């Protein structure tokens, strides 16, 4: 009565470890009897891992988005509200990553509309953080700040944010920097985001370090840049990025805009594509 299901699980696990686009898309609807035969938590984490690898390796937006709407329709016929909201949040993240400003914005607003009444707050914090990201990417700085402040207020009653806290500090640093008015606070927020990202997630950690070093530049203190690059925590993350920021710090301190333009030509491969 369950040996066939065990064969299905073995095939699906081998598929997920292999993880090709067609095999993955087969596996989502291939746990059709599995999803309603096992608990919600394991099904949710499995489908979200398939979605993560799906958007991270086979970046074919057309099929992935349609997969997300197929999954929300699935959870709407099967009445998985928590899973529904989780996949809507993942789709908001995907829309932002592919820069679907309006789709992400409006569907995140719709999600938050029904999410305030739900008891989940970690997913609420995620949704609010992504909404603030969207508002910042649309140059709606005050509304992005308001959304971030609401997210931080919600996360004041958070439940153990391993990276959600770090992501929140990083985004608050982004908002403060974009406000262009204060940098010491932006410095502190970037430092906190970097130190939280330590030993958890590497690319986001290096982006946070890049932002912190940029904030150091913006305070017209390149000496602190050359001190921090050799800081004991930057060695594990040292590389092209920190060297590029160090050289732009030198160009700023020497106040040679020719050196600045040479640094930006060097950046063209490293740190000019990054908003």
């Amino acid at each position: 009565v369950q040996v066939k299901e065990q064969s299905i699980l073995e095939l699906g696990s081998l598929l997920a470890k292999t993880g090709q686009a067609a095999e993955l898309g087969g596996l989502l609807k291939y746990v059709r009897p599995f999803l309603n035969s096992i608990s919600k938590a394991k099904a949710a984490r499995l489908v979200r891992s398939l979605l993560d690898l799906f958007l991270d390796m086979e970046a074919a937006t057309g099929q992935e988005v349609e997969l997300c709407l197929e999954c929300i329709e699935w959870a709407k016929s099967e009445k998985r509200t928590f899973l529904r909201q989780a996949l809507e949040a993942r789709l908001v993240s995907l829309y932002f990553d592919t820069k679907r400003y309006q789709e992400a914005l409006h569907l995140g607003s719709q999600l938050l509309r029904e999410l305030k009444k739900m008891d989940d707050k970690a997913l609420l914090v995620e949704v609010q953080l992504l909404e603030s990201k969207t508002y910042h990417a649309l140059s709606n700085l005050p509304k992005a700040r308001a959304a971030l402040t609401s997210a931080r207020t919600t996360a004041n009653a958070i439940y153990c944010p391993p990276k959600l806290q770090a992501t929140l500090d990083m985004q608050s640093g982004i908002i403060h920097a974009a406000e262009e008015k204060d940098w010491k606070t932006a410095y502190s927020y970037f430092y906190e985001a970097f130190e939280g990202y330590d030993s958890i997630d590497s690319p986001k950690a290096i982006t946070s370090l890049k932002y912190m070093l940029l904030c150091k530049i913006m305070l017209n203190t390149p000496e602190d840049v050359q001190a921090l690059v050799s800081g004991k925590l930057a060695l594990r993350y040292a590389g092209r990025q920190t060297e590029a920021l160090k050289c732009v710090a030198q160009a700023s301190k020497n106040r040679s805009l020719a050196d600045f333009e040479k640094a930006l030509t060097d950046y063209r491969a490293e740190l000019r594509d990054d908003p």
Partner: protein, 232 residues
């Protein structure tokens, strides 16, 4: 209000006995201790940190078992904790002798509460400056209780008293969930010890006991070191 903060048999005109509140203040100044009730068991821990490493940590234990499935931790005075352990053992074993059946933890908490509130009945004897955390498993259910110097006793899904107890309680209520597992319960307890440990817990700096369907057992130093490394 000062003339009434001197005896245990006089009611303050507004409130109640002030010596009980002062005993509670003595309790809140003790060693931090956290107990967590998981779905399948309970975990309670405390910090054994003391200066002068000359001290033999193995000599005394803050977590002691009352019977094969009941354990307790305290926060506050030491000798009063030892006396409470002695009285609790005597009471539980009297119940065992009378009934030839392992003592239910609810009755143990009730009886220990009665014995400690007995010291609050009359003057000349100070109330115990110790609050108790009782862990127990029975009838397929993990029980966690707190016993008060006032003799009050109440239940707790997960609590923490002693020094910096408010921050620990906020941490627990921001961490605990009803579907918590035993190992994750130990992780949360050690994290609660950490957030106000002030000085890099070692294997022997803390002391943690665990109870489950297989009775109660204080964790050995090796398992404590393994869990500390796992949390890091």
């Amino acid at each position: 209000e000062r003339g009434y903060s001197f005896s245990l048999t006089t009611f303050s005109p507004s409130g109640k006995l002030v010596q009980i509140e002062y005993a509670l203040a003595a309790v809140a100044g003790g060693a931090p201790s956290v107990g967590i009730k998981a779905a399948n068991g309970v975990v309670l821990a405390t910090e054994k940190k003391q200066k002068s490493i000359l001290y033999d940590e193995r000599s005394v234990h803050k977590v002691e078992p009352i019977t094969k499935h009941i354990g307790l931790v305290y926060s506050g005075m030491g000798p009063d904790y030892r006396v409470l352990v002695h009285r609790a053992r005597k009471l539980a074993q009297q119940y065992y002798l009378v009934y030839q059946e392992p003592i239910p933890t609810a009755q143990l908490v009730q009886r220990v509460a009665s014995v400690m509130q007995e010291y609050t009945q009359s003057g000349g004897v100070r109330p115990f400056g110790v609050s108790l955390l009782i862990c127990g498993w029975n009838e397929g259910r993990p029980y966690l209780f707190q016993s008060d110097p006032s003799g009050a006793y109440f239940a707790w899904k997960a609590t923490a008293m002693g020094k910096n107890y408010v921050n620990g309680k906020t941490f627990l209520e921001k961490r605990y969930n009803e579907d918590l597992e035993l190992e994750d319960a130990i992780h949360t307890a050690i994290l609660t010890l950490k957030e106000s440990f002030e000085g890099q817990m070692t294997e022997d700096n803390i002391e943690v006991g665990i109870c489950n369907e297989a009775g109660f057992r204080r964790l050995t130093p090796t398992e404590v070191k393994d869990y500390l490394a796992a949390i890091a």
